[PDB]
Design an enzyme around this catalytic site. Sequence first.
Site, PDB file in Angstrom:
ATOM      1  CB  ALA A 128      -7.820  -4.567   4.799  1.00 22.05           C
TER       2      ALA A 128
ATOM      3  CB  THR B  99      -0.937   0.013   1.216  1.00 22.34           C
ATOM      4  OG1 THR B  99      -1.850  -1.079   1.106  1.00 22.34           O
ATOM      5  CG2 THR B  99      -1.701   1.311   1.353  1.00 22.34           C
TER       6      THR B  99
END
Lengths: 196, 196, 212, 202, 202, 204, 220, 200, 200, 214
Positions: free
Chosen positions: H49, H1
């Site tokens: 997440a 990410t």
Amino acid sequence: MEYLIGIQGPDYVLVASDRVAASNIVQMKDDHDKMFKMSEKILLLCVGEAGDTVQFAEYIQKNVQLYKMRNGYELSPTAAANFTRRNLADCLRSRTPYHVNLLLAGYDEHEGPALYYMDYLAALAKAPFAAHGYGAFLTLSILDRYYTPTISRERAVELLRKCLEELQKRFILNLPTFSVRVIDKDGIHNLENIAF
Amino acid sequence: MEYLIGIQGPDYVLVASDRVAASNIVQMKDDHDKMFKMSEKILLLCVGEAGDTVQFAEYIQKNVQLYKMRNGYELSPTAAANFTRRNLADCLRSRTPYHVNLLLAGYDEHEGPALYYMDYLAALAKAPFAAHGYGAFLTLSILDRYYTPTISRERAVELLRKCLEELQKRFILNLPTFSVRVIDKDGIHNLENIAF
Amino acid sequence: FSPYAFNGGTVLAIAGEDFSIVASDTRLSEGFSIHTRDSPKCYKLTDKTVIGCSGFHGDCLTLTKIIEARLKMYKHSNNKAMTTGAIAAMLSTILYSRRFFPYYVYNIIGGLDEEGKGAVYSFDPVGSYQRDSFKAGGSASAMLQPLLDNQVGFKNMQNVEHVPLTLDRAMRLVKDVFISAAERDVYTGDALRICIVTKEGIREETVPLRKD
Amino acid sequence: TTIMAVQFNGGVVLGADSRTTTGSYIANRVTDKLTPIHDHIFCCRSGSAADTQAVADAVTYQLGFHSIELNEPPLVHTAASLFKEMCYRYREDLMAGIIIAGWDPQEGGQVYSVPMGGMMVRQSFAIGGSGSSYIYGYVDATYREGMTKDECLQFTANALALAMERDGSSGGVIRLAAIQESGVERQVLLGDQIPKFTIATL
Amino acid sequence: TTIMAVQFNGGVVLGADSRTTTGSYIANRVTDKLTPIHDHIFCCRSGSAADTQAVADAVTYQLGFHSIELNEPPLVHTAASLFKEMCYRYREDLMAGIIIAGWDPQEGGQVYSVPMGGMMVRQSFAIGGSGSSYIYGYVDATYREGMTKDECLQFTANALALAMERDGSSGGVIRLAAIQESGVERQVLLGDQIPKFTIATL
Amino acid sequence: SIMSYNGGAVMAMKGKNCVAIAADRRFGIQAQMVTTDFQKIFPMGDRLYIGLAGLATDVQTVAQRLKFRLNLYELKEGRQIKPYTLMSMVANLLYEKRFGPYYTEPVIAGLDPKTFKPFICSLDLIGCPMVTDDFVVSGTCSEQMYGMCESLWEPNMDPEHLFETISQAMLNAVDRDAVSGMGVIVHVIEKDKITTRTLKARMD
Amino acid sequence: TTIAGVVYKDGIVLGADTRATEGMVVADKNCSKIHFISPNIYCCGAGTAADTDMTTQLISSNLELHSLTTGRLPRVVTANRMLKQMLFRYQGYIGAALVLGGVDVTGPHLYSIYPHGSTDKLPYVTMGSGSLAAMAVFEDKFRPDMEEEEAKKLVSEAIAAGIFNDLGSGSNIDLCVISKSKLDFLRPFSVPNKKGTRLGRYRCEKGTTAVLTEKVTPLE
Amino acid sequence: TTTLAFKFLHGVIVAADSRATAGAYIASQTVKKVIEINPYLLGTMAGGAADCSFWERLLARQCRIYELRNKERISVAAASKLLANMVYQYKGMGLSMGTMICGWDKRGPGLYYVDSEGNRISGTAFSVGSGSVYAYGVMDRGYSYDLKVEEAYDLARRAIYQATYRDAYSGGAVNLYHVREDGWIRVSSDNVADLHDKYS
Amino acid sequence: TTTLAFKFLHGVIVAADSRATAGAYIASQTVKKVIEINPYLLGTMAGGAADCSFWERLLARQCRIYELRNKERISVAAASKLLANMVYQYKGMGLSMGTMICGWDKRGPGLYYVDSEGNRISGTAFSVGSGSVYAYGVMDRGYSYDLKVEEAYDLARRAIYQATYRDAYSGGAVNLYHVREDGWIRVSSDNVADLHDKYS
Amino acid sequence: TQNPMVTGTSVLGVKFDGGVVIAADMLGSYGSLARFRNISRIMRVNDSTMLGASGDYADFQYLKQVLGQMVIDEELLGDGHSYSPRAIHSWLTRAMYSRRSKMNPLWNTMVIGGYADGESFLGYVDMLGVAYEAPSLATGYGAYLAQPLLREVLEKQPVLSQTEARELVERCMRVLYYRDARSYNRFQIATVTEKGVEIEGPLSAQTNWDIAHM
């Protein structure tokens, strides 16, 4: 952490490294040299464990010098980079493994400039540009965005400044001075040290 | 590691701290403030764990402000330093211990300037000068050799520069800017930031 | 004492223009033995919502009962059935409730949305979820996913017609990828249960797979 | 594993179980734990199946070569001395409790116990293996001096059976052996021949 | 520790050792491991001395209060049920193997074994403690149904003695007890009274 | 894991009268890419190739030591080595370091020097050979490669058809793997030619 | 892996599954587990595949040397001795669980060798991940001195039991009948598992793959 | 990410990738790493997440309730403080979330960085994720406060694209946002493969 | 332990403390931390008492043998290299020794720092020991290359005295040396208690 | 419990035409020693339900007393509503899972056999809360040694008769005695039909040791 960086141009290869020798939390030295001259047109940049780097770098240097002594000609950048990868890989599973990360820069008359990247597990990789250390994470993307194969020697130095400038504003470590050298057909040249 | 430093003079107390907020290996901030105003003449310098410092420093700040609100007068430097030591010591063996190192500087009308040193185990100690962090090991001896109880405000700042200059040449960490404040009878004054 | 166990299984979901398919193998295993060759991993929630659960069978059973109860409670206080999107949102919060002792289940909700289109929501053990066109979970999830990306999403293909996915064609694909998954994954086998979700209720199918 | 050896006038009586297990699974249920070292010298094996088999093989190779050079029947004590040497020398690796038993013309019927550490002690009767713990009190209250060859066979079978019924690592059939000046008398006690003892019921 | 309880027509016969050790040192050599729960209900104790003493105390407090409210002699099974409840409920902490034995007018002489886990099983005779491992084969080959009160006393003393001689954690004197409709008959078997068994010599 | 330190993936597919061998080009330490053109497939003859996935350092070491032995072998008995014989030579080389072996799983693909019969195999780290009649994979995304190979492979495929099948297989397999990709190189070995092409793959 | 063997009326019948798995994924669908030691002696292998292959290759090569020297037919005890002495010397580091079975001058001999070095001589043995399933079949149907066809049926049933009950076993069933006058290597002897037929054709058409660079090198 | 956010003269530029990874297997290539708290507030996600998604959603609920009670929108400083106080209670429990709260309140464009560790700092240019180190280099080298809107988009886009090229756990498409006085707007969503052919 | 060495315009100044500590108990207050390898070579010790003492003595023996073989004294660079190669063979074994090799050879005054870790660097101002951090501050703040001999003595003395004041494992007396062209000379040996009354 | 003390081995269970049959040996082991040789591991829940358990025996007794009190409470109402085998299997699953969620599991692997409304039920409930139904079950070591035989017979003959199932269960016990070191040669056999639950035994299997000589 120590910092190494190499940039290969059309007919030259520019390399640089930090000049800090640190113990625990103090910079014992501010003008330490991390570059080892292997031959007339070959430079070996070594970083890593305390006594491992010098011990390994000097062993390779002596053997490369010996080669020329008994043969007349010098080992090429490719042959020298393979010789050092073999040595490092032979100690990996041995009793005394060398924990050293290094860059091999050189200039062959028939192959042109060459830049080699070798990690501590002895994996040799040729590249247009490479870096070592914790500061390589903050400067590899800078090189990626601005490096072009036909980059000139004056533009290569300008590109190097940008990377070194990024370390001054983003790296937590203090690396004020850098050794800058360049290898071409004429040999190895000592460029002015880049300080901040 | 963060750096704190305080110097108490005849009728003033000078404090300084680094302005770096770092995550992993990058300096996310270069102008971070580590000083918390507790009252008109009281400054709390806090360093340590990620969320611990602000969480603890703001709790103490709110209570000191509350004190003045309901009483009319402000808590003195000594009373404020004991109140914060008590709070920190009550969490030591509790469920959520605060890992914060701090310096409390203030100026009382009847007691004069005051500098307090408190470690993470909540041990309060009054001193003429003190420092926190890994850079305190390289600057405490500089203060020791040059500090004199009657040191002037202009000489105090000059002494502070020497310490900060030592960090630029000896510390492995990169701490370029420093926040400099001074507390006296008039209150807290914001001195020019010392940068390199 | 370990409170978890890997019982294998693999759930597959595919969204269409006016349909939804949720398929899975019926084998339940433990270690290297087979518990039962007849254990569907597809559960019918509402009349247009079907859920597939793979992972720790113990958690699969409990989670499945919790969801069923929650759907009944929601209908009692809101006087209407829960929509696929609402069930997916509710499931996300149920999985995050046990954030420090999570369910070892790989959930996949496949139904229809409010416009009558096929909707597929893939889930992560702690609750992270998102809507997708197709999804595969379980022991053979990394074996089927790549094939679906290629055959359904036309990834890495040049001159191709990009023809809309139809129920007929979707049925073939599902059976084909499960046949390939039974040859390489040792946890997938016995039979294949297919749940077709259209506007006219939910239909169920069953195809025999490799027994070894 | 449960091994036992008793001595009488003529010679000795060896006996053992036949269960070879790996955890809770029986790999071999008809194992022969009584290995012949020489014509009149046998040895019961307990502990590690590969350790005791390698040790018994080595001793058998050495004792036979030694018996040929001397041109004489080997003594039982010499066989015990060879087992003892190997079991002490490699006491860190090997995991074997050997009972050596046999007959020789100079000393008659002798039983030597060579436990895990590698020591060597002569006894009138010995018991080893994991199942021997359950039968210590029975062989203490039941054994008397002056037993005959037939009485030793019954006493050994009774003890092994009692241990097999209580030990999870013992079971199968009972393999007895009688060594004398004559030769060896091997015999197996299958299912119904195995001595039975009633279970306390309510 | 070695405890044993056998039942006959009239009632039961309890017996145990008296050795309390801490490593290789005997803290108490004349310990009484037979605790009276009620007039005709006793209990042998093995495992942890503080755990079994606290459990026996609690049961004794509850059984006596229960016996007063009911205005009736408590059943042996009820005493076993109270021990079982405590030993199961606190099975993670307590380390006690209790044998409950006694006599009541509704069921006569009963022996209940309540081992470490906290289960509860009725037997015609039971043995517990660390020294019980050595006497499993002897109590299996020696016990017969139809034993009298005097025969149970001899059989129990013989078994405890065999275990005491082999176990390092057992020793001292043997404390027997006979429970009947009449009452309790306590008796100690000191040094020479302890049944002896010859040692195999060469 | 030591085998996923550098990443990578190699593949081999059998056609009618030809074989194909493909591999990723990414070279990297953990999550950081260093170069995008690291050689994984090495020529061991005119129609004999070997792919190596695993530790980058061992990939070069095993590839260099194999060439050393192969060169001596061809000089001793003047003849090109047969595909099956090369698999034995590699197995022997790998089994030599039984306790502390090289971290690479080789894949061999080629045609016989006298009959041109397709040959493909794969060995484990300790040198356990496994000849198949369809395809063999090796790398971090082996599970994804199996899925693609199992459903795309067809018996008796021509060079053109074979190339497309191995291209789609590797392409879609490396796109579902984080430490594998950065380009795909494919070698299609025929009887009179060796076609080598680089594929248009993702660079993320 | 499921390997088994029985001693029938006049010989030895060996059998094994053909699936090879690397973890929990099927690597090889048609692997050979029955290894040749000599003309009258064969060996089934379980446990580590690389160890079993190298160990049987060595013992068979040593027995071939021994057979050339003496000029006689090799014995099963010789093979048993060589394997057990080698496995014991590696202190179980060479995980090679084998089922050795052959026929020599002293008749048919069945042996089961474990990785540490222990060996057993029984009338029927089983080895591998699904050895318990094969054993259950041998414990309920094995009869002494069975006919060749009956032994082949029992062994097939044993291998099949492990194939359908153990996750590590699968594919086909290979058999090996060894007698005093013959040696029938039946590979495969049974194909109880069949892959389902593809319902669609995903044939990659020429030009579906985008190419960046391409080079052609002609050969001779 | 890889998520990045910087505030220039025309608001705040927010960019991120769309790759989700479960170990070494790519779970998804279309995940949304930007959360629309409200019309004038944005939140980025990096790390866990489920963690990010859940606490950002909880933050959004608090912001909505805050606006109903005081009949006014919450500031960027107040919103980030709420998120900092929220995750501080589970400090050391294992929560993994690095978020960037961006918006435009009474004090102009506001950019705050908040993580599960306890940090809550305001700034002009941040970068979170495993590919954040690579984004920093490119961002800082071309970042200017007088940057034009079009120039600001290209900078953010290029910064993310170079991070996906070096970081193995970054890739997919670059989703870009632009926070203004009138609220945030979804600028673009270009795939990394399409950016590769444009930058080469 | 606190040892420091710096080379100015008139040679090298070497100072050290004299405290030995076994845990928290002060074993000695008169230990010699400077080793006279030869007339023109000095060696400092820090870390493992037995380690330093033994390997420095072994180095001295090698230097003596070297001079007999080539009829010339060994250089400071060659001497330090010998010590670096010596302790490198037992790298990781636990050896603990930080030494400063000082002298005057053909290249003028030479100062090298060598430890058990493997480091061998040449420089102008070093400091080894647990009180080395404190010495650095004072040394660097008053260090000049044009420093007069008397000024150089006061600097070194003050640097060590301040280190003993802060470091608990440093104290005793300050032993000072001065390396010149004619060889090293023992400058002074002042007790820390006497320096305390002079500096206050 | 965290550490099981006295435990029982595998439990066999098979469904037949009009009922379910469950078998289990009467031995409680304490490590590798056979301590209690005469304990019952099979219980009768009610007229249509019966339960068999392997593992910790003390945990089985607690469950047996809790289940038993539930049946009494339900029979005390007398409203024509009795627990079915599936409802008992469901309750057990929830109880086993609840205990495993609190990290204090009941170390047991149960087999539920029943017969209600003309349908035979065979459920399995392990300590983790993993529950499922099947034509034939086998716990502990029965899954590796008895399940293969039981499954082979149900593949050719899906529907068995009482006599077929009973004799097939005796073949499994014989194999268990031969290969399981934690088993006993004295087992019980419970059958459930329309007439109710019937517990038979103590029975013994007929072993053969002809391989000892050969």
